[PDB]
Design a protein around this ligand. Structure first.
Ligand SMILES: Nc1nc2ncc([C@H](O)[C@H](O)CO)nc2c(=O)[nH]1
Length: 138
């Protein structure tokens, strides 16, 4: 693959848009440094924040339905977007993520800085190998 191949589809109001790594990196507004239940120590995760992705799509309040390559899925509620602003990470310590290393996109919450490292609800919303995001409006 390469930085210009599509890796994500976003659906909003019955319309689908595709995005490449190159595109997502150009819109990457947030780095989260955090521990996770599946990694050692602190990791730096850079990508497009949930708030930034909604702004791009022309929405302020919405939930996100996130689906992974392996079919796992989880909905990120607006309340989490407001309170935690999780990042759709495309880099792990500054480099792209191979599918075999939870890539190409992984939703990451600021567990360390929010004191939520043991919060299983937030863990369940940290979806690796993301392939699609659907914006769910009220
Ligand atoms: N793609 C993908 N992402 C995941 N993210 C988090 C967790 C955690 O185990 C959750 O706590 C499970 O609900 N599981 C998964 C998973 O299986 N698949």
């Amino acid at each position: 693959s390469n930085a210009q191949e599509p890796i994500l589809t976003i659906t909003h109001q019955g319309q689908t848009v595709s995005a490449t790594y190159q595109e997502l990196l150009a819109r990457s507004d947030l780095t989260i440094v955090t521990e996770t239940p599946w990694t050692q120590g602190n990791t730096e995760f850079k990508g497009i924040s949930a708030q930034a992705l909604l702004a791009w799509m022309g929405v302020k309040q919405a939930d996100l339905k996130v689906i992974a390559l392996n079919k796992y899925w989880a909905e990120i509620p607006y309340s989490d977007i407001e309170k935690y602003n999780p990042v759709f990470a495309i880099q792990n310590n500054g480099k792209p993520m191979q599918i075999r290393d939870r890539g190409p996109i992984w939703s990451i919450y600021p567990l360390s800085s929010s004191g939520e490292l043991d919060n299983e609800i937030l863990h369940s919303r940290m979806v690796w190998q993301i392939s699609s995001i659907e914006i769910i409006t009220p």
